[PDB]
């Protein structure tokens, strides 16, 4: 037969929110645990605390989503991502997509008020 691969979890939509939050916290713990493995695999310049900070931000972004089905989908995609990272399927190029802030300063002019945006036709 075709058997599942490493860190594969069968797709299951939780019927109750609480049973989903259990899995969600497990997944968060897995990501935090794997952070050093990610730092070794992908030869990152930045520190393990920064990996963990990024993970916390990612989990934070959906902290107020209510409808259960959307939470189920987000959890499934988060697990798919975890499996992608931990198995070194991803390369450094795609991994660093997650990390747009640690790249250097892109330039002198990042407009913030209406006059600087207007001068660059981005108002």
110 near other proteins, rule: CB under 8 A: yes
Query: Given the rule CB under 8 A, which of 12-20, 28-36, 48-56, 63-71 is the region that contacts other proteins?
Result: 63-71
Query: Interacting stretch for other proteins, rule CB under 8 A, among 3-11, 19-27, 30-38, 106-114?
Result: 106-114
Is there binding between residue 119 and other proteins (CB under 8 A)? yes
Q: What whole-number distance in Å separates Cα of residue 44 and Cα of residue 89?
A: 16
Q: Which of 4, 8, 26, 70 binds other proteins (CB under 8 A)?
A: 70
Instruction: Decide whether 3 or 105 has the Cβ nearer to other proteins.
Output: 105
Instruction: Residue 28: name the closest of 7, 57, 49 by CA.
Output: 57
Q: Which helix (H) or strand (E) holds 83?
A: helix 68-86
Burial label, 41 (beta-carbon count in 10 A; 0-12, 13-18, 19+): middle
Q: In this structure, what are the phi and psi dihedrals at residue 76, rounded to the nearest 5 degrees?
A: -60, -45
**Contact with other proteins (CB under 8 A) among 8, 25, 73, 80:** 73
Verify binding: residue 29, other proteins, rule CB under 8 A.
no
97 binds other proteins (CB under 8 A): no
Structure-block tokens of residue 37: 């493995």
Torsion of CA 27, 32, 87, 100, to 10 degrees: 110
Binding site residues, other proteins, CB under 8 A: 43, 45, 61-62, 65, 67, 70, 73-74, 77, 104-110, 113-115, 118-123
């Amino acid at each position: 037969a075709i058997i599942a691969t490493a860190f594969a979890e069968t797709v299951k939509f939780s019927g109750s929110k609480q049973e989903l939050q259990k899995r969600t916290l497990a997944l968060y713990r897995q990501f935090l645990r794997g952070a050093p493995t990610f730092a070794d695999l992908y030869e990152v310049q930045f520190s393990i605390p920064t990996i963990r900070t990024k993970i916390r931000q990612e989990f934070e972004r959906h902290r107020f989503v209510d409808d259960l089905s959307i939470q189920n989908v987000l959890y499934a995609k988060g697990h798919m991502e975890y499996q992608e990272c931990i198995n070194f399927w991803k390369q450094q190029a795609q991994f660093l997509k997650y990390f747009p802030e640690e790249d250097d300063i892109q330039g002198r002019h990042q407009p913030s008020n209406f006059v600087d945006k207007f001068l660059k036709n981005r108002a």
